[PDB]
């Protein structure tokens, strides 16, 4: 079975009022976990790859080679996309595409609107010609940075959302509305009113970043307001490392890596299964 | 620049009186570290894959895809072999070969001699028809040690045409209880009786002098695994212990990978294959 873009799975999800989880890939065991979770739950799944993570894994080509081999050899039957997360530029998106990515996000939300539109439109030209899905962003997703206002959150402007989607033809849009990458300082403060307006006026699947720490009620609400893709990364790292700590603290002698990395991989699998069910994509393959 | 079998690199080591290290692969970061070490040292390298490690990494096909992609994308220019370590059966060696392994070890040393010979011959015929190098074994590596018999070595090499031979002569997988007691006189006989490169198993914990002495007695391939696991985990422990809060895996896997890289470099230099690429 071959890889697919995110087009079909996200449209099906929007119509079905559930979301497809993107879970970020970090290495080989991370990927086995995510795919195993998706297979067991009979759910579509998106493998997110940041440029940083791609470097950790040598590059886009190693990433694609490894995913393809795993799909074949694990017998994965469910829809899988490989999506470049927070693509820096046209050139990065093109490289990921040529390497065999089936989806890319061009994130130019930190640039002036008109530059964002221009860059994004260009990425879309190249991607759609190759049956690659595209995500873009408006507003700023929060983070763990120092000396920022409100964790660095800047709400998307629904009017710009409308214009950018109309001008570029992206397949999905991330309107940053309170998402923070990594843990939230307090309870997330998601702009559901703004989201409702972005849903009204774009008509495309929306993407909700910074999934770790967003309580179930906010997840259901976001989905009910047009969110069809939700990204989780931090939570997998947290659970992976908790399981690795447990093993290393209880047995001070062990050095066989699979004795601590295995339980960590299992922890990730169970974490992804939980989020899959929470998002409503189980049985939707 | 594709993967090669072990034939050329081991014959060069034998003539050059040095050894090529086999370093066992356990995952993606493990492979990156081994390849980076070899490339930096301009040294041939052998990537070892046990059947258990193959499974941990899903399978033989995933192993090959990963290595081939890393080779191209890291710009690896030195000789690299992928070697099924302790192949348990003809069928396992066939599967590895079919997946694109360039080298296999059929280990039937724990069966009667004539069965070992017969099985090994079967693997050699399949492998050599595909330019795949073959290792076989006599005697038992500790994990209890049993010395290979030099006459059986002569006969097995002659009957099979294997490219290299592991005469178990004191090797122990993992840490040695005391200090190794290698059968150097036995090894010399095997060297002389066979004329093929010999393989030293259980390199972790074999002191420098024993290594240099094994090489002078015809050892051209030296397997190392445990020491990489020890250094990797040691580096992980240091990070997790000093920082009770960190959860980002690259923060501890990263230094684990560095530790392995440094360990392989040291072993490559000790084995003498730096600059032999
Ligand atoms: Na978050
Ligand atoms: Na050893
Ligand atoms: Zn890294
Ligand atoms: Zn930018
Ligand atoms: Zn415009
Ligand atoms: Zn994000
Ligand atoms: Zn948790
Ligand atoms: Zn395993
Ligand atoms: Zn038998
Ligand atoms: Zn036994
Ligand atoms: Zn002598
Ligand atoms: Zn061995």
UniProtKB/TrEMBL annotation, chain B:
<feature type="binding site">
    <location>
        <position position="86"/>
    </location>
    <ligand>
        <name>Zn(2+) 2</name>
    </ligand>
</feature>
<feature type="binding site">
    <location>
        <position position="111"/>
    </location>
    <ligand>
        <name>Zn(2+) 4</name>
    </ligand>
</feature>
<feature type="binding site">
    <location>
        <position position="225"/>
    </location>
    <ligand>
        <name>dihydroxyacetone phosphate</name>
    </ligand>
</feature>
<feature type="binding site">
    <location>
        <position position="231"/>
    </location>
    <ligand>
        <name>Zn(2+) 6</name>
    </ligand>
</feature>
<feature type="binding site">
    <location>
        <position position="204"/>
    </location>
    <ligand>
        <name>dihydroxyacetone phosphate</name>
    </ligand>
</feature>
<feature type="binding site">
    <location>
        <position position="202"/>
    </location>
    <ligand>
        <name>dihydroxyacetone phosphate</name>
    </ligand>
</feature>
<feature type="binding site">
    <location>
        <begin position="223"/>
        <end position="226"/>
    </location>
    <ligand>
        <name>dihydroxyacetone phosphate</name>
    </ligand>
</feature>
<feature type="binding site">
    <location>
        <position position="115"/>
    </location>
    <ligand>
        <name>Zn(2+) 4</name>
    </ligand>
</feature>
<keyword id="KW-0862">Zinc</keyword>
<protein>
    <submittedName>
        <fullName>Fructose-bisphosphate aldolase, class II</fullName>
        <ecNumber>4.1.2.13</ecNumber>
    </submittedName>
</protein>
<dbReference type="GO" id="GO:0004332">
    <property type="term" value="F:fructose-bisphosphate aldolase activity"/>
</dbReference>
<feature type="binding site">
    <location>
        <position position="188"/>
    </location>
    <ligand>
        <name>Zn(2+) 5</name>
    </ligand>
</feature>
<feature type="binding site">
    <location>
        <position position="85"/>
    </location>
    <ligand>
        <name>dihydroxyacetone phosphate</name>
    </ligand>
</feature>
<dbReference type="InterPro" id="IPR011289">
    <property type="entry name" value="Fruc_bis_ald_class-2"/>
</dbReference>
<feature type="binding site">
    <location>
        <position position="107"/>
    </location>
    <ligand>
        <name>Zn(2+) 2</name>
    </ligand>
</feature>
<feature type="binding site">
    <location>
        <position position="226"/>
    </location>
    <ligand>
        <name>dihydroxyacetone phosphate</name>
    </ligand>
</feature>
<feature type="binding site">
    <location>
        <position position="201"/>
    </location>
    <ligand>
        <name>Zn(2+) 2</name>
    </ligand>
</feature>
<dbReference type="InterPro" id="IPR013785">
    <property type="entry name" value="Aldolase_TIM"/>
</dbReference>
<dbReference type="Pfam" id="PF01116">
    <property type="entry name" value="F_bP_aldolase"/>
</dbReference>
<feature type="active site" description="Proton donor">
    <location>
        <position position="85"/>
    </location>
</feature>
<dbReference type="InterPro" id="IPR050246">
    <property type="entry name" value="Class_II_FBP_aldolase"/>
</dbReference>
<feature type="binding site">
    <location>
        <begin position="202"/>
        <end position="204"/>
    </location>
    <ligand>
        <name>dihydroxyacetone phosphate</name>
    </ligand>
</feature>
<dbReference type="GO" id="GO:0008270">
    <property type="term" value="F:zinc ion binding"/>
</dbReference>
<dbReference type="GO" id="GO:0030388">
    <property type="term" value="P:fructose 1,6-bisphosphate metabolic process"/>
</dbReference>
<feature type="binding site">
    <location>
        <position position="227"/>
    </location>
    <ligand>
        <name>Zn(2+) 6</name>
    </ligand>
</feature>
<feature type="binding site">
    <location>
        <position position="223"/>
    </location>
    <ligand>
        <name>dihydroxyacetone phosphate</name>
    </ligand>
</feature>
<dbReference type="InterPro" id="IPR000771">
    <property type="entry name" value="FBA_II"/>
</dbReference>
<feature type="binding site">
    <location>
        <position position="56"/>
    </location>
    <ligand>
        <name>Zn(2+) 1</name>
    </ligand>
</feature>
<feature type="binding site">
    <location>
        <position position="86"/>
    </location>
    <ligand>
        <name>Zn(2+) 1</name>
    </ligand>
</feature>
<feature type="binding site">
    <location>
        <position position="174"/>
    </location>
    <ligand>
        <name>dihydroxyacetone phosphate</name>
    </ligand>
</feature>
<feature type="binding site">
    <location>
        <position position="201"/>
    </location>
    <ligand>
        <name>Zn(2+) 1</name>
    </ligand>
</feature>
<feature type="binding site">
    <location>
        <position position="110"/>
    </location>
    <ligand>
        <name>Zn(2+) 3</name>
    </ligand>
</feature>
<dbReference type="GO" id="GO:0006096">
    <property type="term" value="P:glycolytic process"/>
</dbReference>
<keyword id="KW-0479">Metal-binding</keyword>
<feature type="binding site">
    <location>
        <position position="173"/>
    </location>
    <ligand>
        <name>Zn(2+) 1</name>
    </ligand>
</feature>
<keyword id="KW-0456">Lyase</keyword>
<feature type="binding site">
    <location>
        <position position="173"/>
    </location>
    <ligand>
        <name>Zn(2+) 2</name>
    </ligand>
</feature>
<feature type="binding site">
    <location>
        <position position="137"/>
    </location>
    <ligand>
        <name>Zn(2+) 2</name>
    </ligand>
</feature>
